[PDB]
Amino acid sequence: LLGEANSFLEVLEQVSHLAPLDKPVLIIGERGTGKELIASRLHYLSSRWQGPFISLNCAALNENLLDSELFGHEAKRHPGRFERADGGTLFLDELATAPMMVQEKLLRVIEYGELERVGGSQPLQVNVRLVCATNADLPAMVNEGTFRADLLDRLAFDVVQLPPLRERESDIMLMAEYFAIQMCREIKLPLFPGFTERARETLLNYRWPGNIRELKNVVERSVYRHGTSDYPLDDIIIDPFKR
Numbered sequence: 001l002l003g004e005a006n007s008f009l010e011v012l013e014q015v016s017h018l019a020p021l022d023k024p025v026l027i028i029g030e031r032g033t034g035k036e037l038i039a040s041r042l043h044y045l046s047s048r049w050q051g052p053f054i055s056l057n058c059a060a061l062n063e064n065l066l067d068s069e070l071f072g073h074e075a076k077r078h079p080g081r082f083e084r085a086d087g088g089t090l091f092l093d094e095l096a097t098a099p100m101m102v103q104e105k106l107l108r109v110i111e112y113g114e115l116e117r118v119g120g121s122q123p124l125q126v127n128v129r130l131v132c133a134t135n136a137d138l139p140a141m142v143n144e145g146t147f148r149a150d151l152l153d154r155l156a157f158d159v160v161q162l163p164p165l166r167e168r169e170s171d172i173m174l175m176a177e178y179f180a181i182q183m184c185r186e187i188k189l190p191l192f193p194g195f196t197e198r199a200r201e202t203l204l205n206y207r208w209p210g211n212i213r214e215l216k217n218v219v220e221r222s223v224y225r226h227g228t229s230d231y232p233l234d235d236i237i238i239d240p241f242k243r
């Protein structure tokens with residue numbers, strides 16, 4: 001993991017303490033800030049490290065498919081993500097998009113340690129360390145009636161706040177350099193020739209709504225379009241759609 005900003009280093013320290021606990025952890029941060037990477041770090045630093053690490057993007061599925069993907073269904077079986085994570089960790093991304101029906105069912109799994117399994121088959125007991133992520137203001141949603149207060153009262157045992165790249169301004173150039181060098185290797189340039197002051201201004205003044213994912217893409221495209229080691233990279237191509 002790249003980064004020397006104190007805000008980022010404080011996250012890594014927090015994660016090293018939280019990881020060994022079986023308690024649920026909420027990660028708040030923008031897209032591209034490394035939320036999944038942090039969830040993974042929580043699993044690999046925990047006592048569950050040899051168990052499975054399973055992920056699911058709540059925003060990606062309609063209500064009935066999300067219900068079935070998470071909790072499973074009987075119509076043999078399609079095991080849900082809680083079952084597949086048994087003895088391990090389950091990372092639920094974009095939590096704030098989970099419908100209220102899913103949120104209530106999730107609280108039940110957390111409070112009772114089991115999944116309901118219709119009739120015929122006994123309820124399934126599960127043993128899963130939960131990590132969830134979002135960029136929403138969950139307390140505001142609770143006020144608006146779009147997120148369950150009860151779920152949040154129990155789910156947010158602690159909160160990891162990942163800083164956006166624009167608040168780690170020291171790390172922008174560090175990471176840009178790293179990504180430029182890697183792209184130099186990929187296209188066989190002998191040396192990364194540096195960033196001009198204009199390029200640095202462009203990099204540091206942009207707000208990076210896509211954070212680290214967007215930085216890496218921008219920098220790769222920019223090295224490629226530059227295409228030489230003979231002189232420093234001057235043109236940072238933030239928006240490939242205008243040219």
Ligand SMILES: Nc1ncnc2c1ncn2[C@@H]1O[C@H](COP(=O)(O)OP(=O)(O)NP(=O)(O)O)[C@@H](O)[C@H]1O
Pocket residue numbers: 001002003029030031032033034035036037038093212213
């Ligand atoms: N500190 C870091 N150092 C190096 N690469 C990073 C760092 N944090 C994130 N990345 C990279 O940026 C990417 C996005 O990280 P990811 O963990 O998927 O972020 P995310 O916050 O979960 N984004 P999203 O899919 O929109 O929810 C991946 O290519 C990375 O490996």
